[PDB]
Design a protein around this motif. Structure first.
Motif: not given
Ligand SMILES: COc1ccc2nc(C)c(O[C@@H]3C[C@H]4C(=O)N[C@]5(C(=O)NS(=O)(=O)C6(C)CC6)C[C@H]5/C=C\CCCCC[C@H](NC(=O)OC5CCC5)C(=O)N4C3)nc2c1
Ligand SMILES: [Zn+2]
Length: 195
Positions: A57-59, A93-98, A138-140, A150-156, A171-173
């Motif tokens: 993975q990349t991010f 902190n898995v509860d925060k995805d952090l 925690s949202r915008g 276009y957002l995939k890979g930008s978590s963090g 963390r999520a989209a």
């Molecule tokens: C395993 O232990 C864990 C503990 C806590 C935890 N907590 C999370 C919220 C979580 O969510 C997962 C991964 C993210 C993600 O994909 N993160 C982005 C990203 O870019 N990742 S990444 O590509 O860099 C990657 C995978 C290399 C690292 C930023 C997105 C970009 C595009 C989205 C693509 C479709 C996906 C749409 C999803 N929607 C969504 O879940 O929305 C809901 C949250 C409230 C509603 C979404 O975003 N996720 C689904 N997994 C976990 C796992």
């Protein structure tokens, strides 16, 4: 009984130093693979937003207050590669995805925002600076929605205020029909608590 997971590796950065935001790559695929297995990264580190990779993975990862922060769904519990070997997570902190490690020598840290502003900017791994209106703790919402691709890979990556302070970690989209309308992030206050 008689394998180990690899380290997270810094493979580039998003340069926010000048007038233009741009991505820079500092390590290619082969050096990344080798550095993930050894955990030994001799490359100089600069800037606030690092591009990071595992074998699979990349991010992104972002330095705020002397900690390099990223998402648990990217890094898991992995070490990060460093000049003296793998470095164990300082925060998990898995509860925060952090997760977080001590910030690398040479990095620059963003300052935590105390502005209270709801006019944010998300920095992506392609050096896009995307306007986002804060809608909650925690949202915008994206002012200009676009495919989630276009957002995939930008978590963090950071959400920044108009003054360039860190407001959160992406963390999520949230999408409809594959179109990203909103984002979720770890608020800087939740990091400052963890800290
Ligand atoms: C395993 O232990 C864990 C503990 C806590 C935890 N907590 C999370 C919220 C979580 O969510 C997962 C991964 C993210 C993600 O994909 N993160 C982005 C990203 O870019 N990742 S990444 O590509 O860099 C990657 C995978 C290399 C690292 C930023 C997105 C970009 C595009 C989205 C693509 C479709 C996906 C749409 C999803 N929607 C969504 O879940 O929305 C809901 C949250 C409230 C509603 C979404 O975003 N996720 C689904 N997994 C976990 C796992
Ligand atoms: Zn601010």
């Amino acid at each position: 009984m008689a394998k180990k997971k690899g380290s997270v590796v810094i493979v580039g950065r998003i340069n926010l130093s000048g007038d233009t935001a741009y991505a820079q790559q500092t390590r290619g695929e082969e050096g990344c693979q080798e550095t993930s297995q050894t955990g030994r990264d001799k490359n100089q580190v600069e800037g606030e937003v690092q591009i990071v990779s595992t074998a699979t993975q990349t991010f992104l990862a972002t330095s705020i207050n002397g900690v390099l922060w990223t998402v648990y769904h990217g890094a898991g519990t992995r070490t990060i590669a460093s000049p003296k070997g793998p470095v164990t997570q300082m925060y998990t902190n898995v509860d925060k995805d952090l997760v977080g490690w001590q910030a690398p020598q040479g990095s620059r840290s963003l300052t935590p925002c105390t502005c209270g502003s709801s006019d944010l900017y998300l920095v992506t791994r392609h050096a896009d600076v995307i306007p986002v209106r804060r809608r909650g703790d925690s949202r915008g919402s994206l002012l200009s929605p676009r495919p989630i691709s276009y957002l995939k890979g930008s978590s963090g990556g950071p959400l920044l205020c108009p003054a360039g302070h860190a407001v959160g970690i992406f963390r999520a989209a949230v999408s409809t029909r594959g179109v990203a309308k909103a984002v979720a992030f770890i608020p800087v206050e939740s990091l400052e608590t963890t800290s």
